[PDB]
Design a protein around this ligand. Sequence first.
Ligand SMILES: *CC(=O)CC[C@@H](C)[C@H]1CC[C@H]2[C@@H]3CC[C@@H]4C[C@H](O)CC[C@]4(C)[C@H]3CC[C@]12C
Ligand SMILES: *CC(=O)CC[C@@H](C)[C@H]1CC[C@H]2[C@@H]3CC[C@@H]4C[C@H](O)CC[C@]4(C)[C@H]3CC[C@]12C
Ligand SMILES: *CC(=O)CC[C@@H](C)[C@H]1CC[C@H]2[C@@H]3CC[C@@H]4C[C@H](O)CC[C@]4(C)[C@H]3CC[C@]12C
Ligand SMILES: *CC(=O)CC[C@@H](C)[C@H]1CC[C@H]2[C@@H]3CC[C@@H]4C[C@H](O)CC[C@]4(C)[C@H]3CC[C@]12C
Ligand code: NI
Lengths: 324, 329, 329, 324
Amino acid sequence: CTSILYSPKDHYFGRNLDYEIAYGQKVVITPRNYEFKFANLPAEKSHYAMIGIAAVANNTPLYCDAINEKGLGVAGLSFAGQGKYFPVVEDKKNIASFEFISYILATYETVDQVKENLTDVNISDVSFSKNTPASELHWLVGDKTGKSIVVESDEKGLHVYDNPVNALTNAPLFPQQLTNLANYAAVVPGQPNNDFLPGVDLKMYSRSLGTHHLPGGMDSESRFVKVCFALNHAPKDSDEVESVTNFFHILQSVEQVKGMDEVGPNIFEYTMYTSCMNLEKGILYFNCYDDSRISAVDMNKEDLSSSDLIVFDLFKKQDISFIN
Amino acid sequence: CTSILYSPKDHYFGRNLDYEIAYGQKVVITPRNYEFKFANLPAEKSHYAMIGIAAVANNTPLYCDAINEKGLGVAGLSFAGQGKYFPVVEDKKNIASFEFISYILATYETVDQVKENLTDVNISDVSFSKNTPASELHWLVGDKTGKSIVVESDEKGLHVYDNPVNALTNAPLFPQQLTNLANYAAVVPGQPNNDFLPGVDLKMYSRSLGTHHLPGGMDSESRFVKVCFALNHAPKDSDEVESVTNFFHILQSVEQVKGMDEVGPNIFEYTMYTSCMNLEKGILYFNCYDDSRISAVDMNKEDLSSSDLIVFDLFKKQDISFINHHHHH
Amino acid sequence: CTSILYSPKDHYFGRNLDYEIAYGQKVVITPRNYEFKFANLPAEKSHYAMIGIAAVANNTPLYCDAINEKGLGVAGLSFAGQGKYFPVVEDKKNIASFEFISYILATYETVDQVKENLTDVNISDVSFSKNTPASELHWLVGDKTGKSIVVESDEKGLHVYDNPVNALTNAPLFPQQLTNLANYAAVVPGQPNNDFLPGVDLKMYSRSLGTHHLPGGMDSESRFVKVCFALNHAPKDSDEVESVTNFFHILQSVEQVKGMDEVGPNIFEYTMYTSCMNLEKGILYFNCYDDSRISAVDMNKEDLSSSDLIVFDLFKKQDISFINHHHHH
Amino acid sequence: CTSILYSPKDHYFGRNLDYEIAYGQKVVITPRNYEFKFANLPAEKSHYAMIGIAAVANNTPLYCDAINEKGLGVAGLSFAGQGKYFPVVEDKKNIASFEFISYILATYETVDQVKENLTDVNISDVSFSKNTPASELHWLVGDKTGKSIVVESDEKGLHVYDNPVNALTNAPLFPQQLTNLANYAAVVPGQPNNDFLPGVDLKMYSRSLGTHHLPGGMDSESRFVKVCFALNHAPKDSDEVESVTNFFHILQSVEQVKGMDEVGPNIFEYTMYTSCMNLEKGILYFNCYDDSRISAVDMNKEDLSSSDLIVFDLFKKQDISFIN
Ligand SMILES: *CC(=O)CC[C@@H](C)[C@H]1CC[C@H]2[C@@H]3CC[C@@H]4C[C@H](O)CC[C@]4(C)[C@H]3CC[C@]12C
Ligand SMILES: *CC(=O)CC[C@@H](C)[C@H]1CC[C@H]2[C@@H]3CC[C@@H]4C[C@H](O)CC[C@]4(C)[C@H]3CC[C@]12C
Ligand SMILES: *CC(=O)CC[C@@H](C)[C@H]1CC[C@H]2[C@@H]3CC[C@@H]4C[C@H](O)CC[C@]4(C)[C@H]3CC[C@]12C
Ligand SMILES: *CC(=O)CC[C@@H](C)[C@H]1CC[C@H]2[C@@H]3CC[C@@H]4C[C@H](O)CC[C@]4(C)[C@H]3CC[C@]12C
Ligand code: NI
């Protein structure tokens, strides 16, 4: 997985979900008066509404990525082998990992507000049920200011990092991902000037030789480097449909095609869905491996004063337009 | 530009068209009785029908990529800086570069047949008009045998290569593209065995560290290596819709996003359209940069015995499916 | 800038020192009764003897790398932009960065001992003099067990890491260096098996295509990855001269030639000297950019119980063996 | 395996020889009056004198690399899998592969002369002996003008290329080698300007991040790219000893250490010797895997009017200078 915040005019937040098996994800709106029962925090019977992609178990939305009605977004991405959660402690605010997106989006409106309120927080090892152990996650948090943060709980505790590139993948720890970007500092979209062999006429036989060393791999570092590049150079000052179109193309630059990422014998990680959420307008755009047509759900066309989850299909069949 | 032949069950031929400016491309069916006026060859008033993406100029289809009713396909890709065209000569069959796709698809059925009949061919320097200079191209030719060839006219004449990877991009010359592939022979889709530092325990901190050196650049060699990999490892034995779906994903593994490939001062090459044609069935599937929904035109639903070009729009606006409209129909 | 511990039979500790400024380095033996006047620790007038490369100022040895008579070695390498030193504090054993090598070698014998005694230590911000500010360093510590540790003082304090690859360069932080190695797990000295494009014959046009992605840059990560590989695959079970010869070849594979590493206008970082120190025997072998002949100084051929520094020249002119001299002796 | 022409002030021509088998090489001077018995050319009893590294068999020098007294140099490097030799033909000047260095250095003075005279040449399949089959080679030719050419006989015949980088390794064909160079056009010895992520502050955590993608592998393309760079940026305007020292450092940067290039089960290609040959002065400097001290043989301190081969040892034991 790969998550980005894109700021051409309005602000768009979303991610590719790359895995070998689905968890019954659907489009889920949680209205203001759905009652969250948090594990080690007071229950919240009135809170912000949110929309995102979630698994639903026992009438509970287990979000993978979502935005709230105030224009804050959070995406959870796998952090296996890097992350660590800690036992509930009395001196802190204990948030279980499976409810971190819900809690943050229920309660806060801005990245700055999240930074302030995380200083006293412990991401606990509580799991949703005996049947569902707590998978290892880290989070991207973004909002309408165009800035994001990275939230990582590891061996040395909870860390909150300013994210100057507005993107996140999987391992390694976020400071290492940032450092590795300097290794690509000579990459350019066009042609470099020849300071490689001064006095020699090199035949620039292809366009874009400046990107010859841009990573194309399916591993976590390669996708992080390439998406940072695609995001940084994407168009600006676009209106709604053009902004959504370019958002999907940025994430397709690091999509995983079936066969390229082998995680067990004939088991492949592939890009199962892509979500694009307009922070200003509360609209979720999406497509999936089997359907390239973009679909859209608008949060504000629903009764946000309600208390029941409002659910829509995510995975769809290829929707071909037959011309003749 | 990137062109592939994919053979999961039926066979699919198509390409990404990456460039900075459109040339009025549309979907064009040329029926059997449209009369080709070839520059230096006998006119053909009866021939195989074909479907593909083309510009239309003075009621002449100038194809970018197409397939014919017998299951042959040809795509033209830029070969600028590598190619060479030659003056018309009497000792050869002279095919102008702009008409190569039309001539081959009007006349032949199989790759083997094309290979036999190119032995005496000169790709000529004739252009479509005094005011439309001949763009520099090389071609991928594929068919339902799952095999393909590369046709290249350079400084040493016309060359025809067997294509063991069923893909093609731009420069350099095709043997160089194949040699370069061996530089990536250690790539695997999963995790390698650690013969790098024997005795040392290297934590495999990410999935697919075997692809860590797979190229992701927008340049010609980078796209060639990546698409060869994506095409080789794509699923097999799939039915129609699932095959088409996987075909578009193979080509999206090398798509060009606006901003990533700069070819002039703030001028960008991007993937303007993607085509996918079923050789068995004569169906053209397509999308474009602005519309990710796949569209389809079936050549066999038209009157193939006619003599007029049949045209459909290629470039489309984004076709969003609004789910919770609350129209309450 | 590149330091290694090499364990073919005997154990060898040493380093390339690559830089653009020289600091008057010489070979320096510190005998057992030289009086160390540490900045914030009691003086030691009797201690282990040691030999290495050092500057000498005000009759004090300021070591860049050295070993002691017990077979412990320490090398200091630039850590600019990553390291942090801290003010002297009462709760801690305060060691100044410029005296870290001297103190460790004067006091301890084994890596395990160093690891046990660093738990309460603070690397202090004290400088040797007003005209000699404390350059930012981190250290490699190795011994005759063939194991090593990395000692780094950064924004989060002092850390001590076991080093499974027995090598060290400059930035970034050592856990990041280790992690980066997994990115090269598919590298092999020979030819990989083709699991890249199964069913395609890839002509292995060159020997050692398994190292096509091995880094050759002058930067810190590139040298770390390549030296780890050369050190891992170097010959074992070898006599003194053959062991020393292979050691120099390992470090030469990551040497910085003048012109390749530009650090200012027409100013270059280059490999000023290479040291190789036999831990069991107390011999230092060295050459330098201007002299490729290897020189040797044996510690145990001096009076190890004196109290004056014993100094020898490090940098030399090229020492060419003229063969067909026709002296007819 | 790697050959260069280096032109700081005087002109230096030489090579690393990297292999897993030795061929009895020695330093060999061939005086003006040694009689060459060429397979299909008239015998030459009077010719230019030369010095180089050669095997000696049946009183015949089989050169690996050498220079002549006029300042012309030739080096033979493996072309296995790429080269082709052809049967003797009446229409051509037929030169056997093992005698190409000998004939060229005996007959010609300049690179331009060699170009003019290769138009009628055919590299023949004639071998030296039943125990010495004709190994597949291609050649670098350089002279004191600071120019060089590449001579390659392949399936399409004999080709002569102008060499803009004054270096050569093994496969592939030379035009492909030059094309591959353009893939490194963004490499610089210092720090690149950040046009990769404009607007983002990339910490340049190490010196020479401009060389992060320079090849360090043992394969033919990797050594070619790196040595071309090391050669191009090496110092200029230097005196004799300074120049020779820099020449050896250039080739050390692409040396093959034992264990990094495996060609058989526990069998390794490694740099067995390095030769450096001053074109103006006729001096051969050399060292070898086992001895890093540099040795020198001056061609002009011998009687060049003689007719017998003058031989010295090449491979030596490590010559350590014990100080105390
Ligand atoms: C691409 C990558 O990073 C893999 C991420 C997948 C496997 C993650 C992303 C979000 C995850 C959900 C989050 C909600 C619950 C949390 C529970 O602790 C475990 C089940 C759960 C549905 C997670 C499953 C894995 C998940 C989809
Ligand atoms: C991605 C890449 O290689 C760019 C290829 C584009 C620019 C090429 C490919 C097909 C070309 C057509 C072919 C038909 C005619 C031929 C005439 O000689 C020139 C006009 C023409 C429409 C070409 C324009 C460029 C073209 C789309
Ligand atoms: C690439 C790289 O690591 C270069 C390291 C150079 C610049 C370092 C290594 C050891 C250093 C010595 C250590 C002894 C003293 C310490 C004083 O604080 C400063 C002067 C001193 C001679 C250092 C100079 C830099 C140095 C050679
Ligand atoms: C990597 C690389 O280039 C290694 C090249 C080695 C193996 C070549 C280079 C010169 C060769 C000599 C040339 C003289 C004779 C020629 C005969 O035809 C065969 C024997 C001979 C000694 C060659 C052996 C291989 C050789 C050292
Ligand atoms: Ni309606």
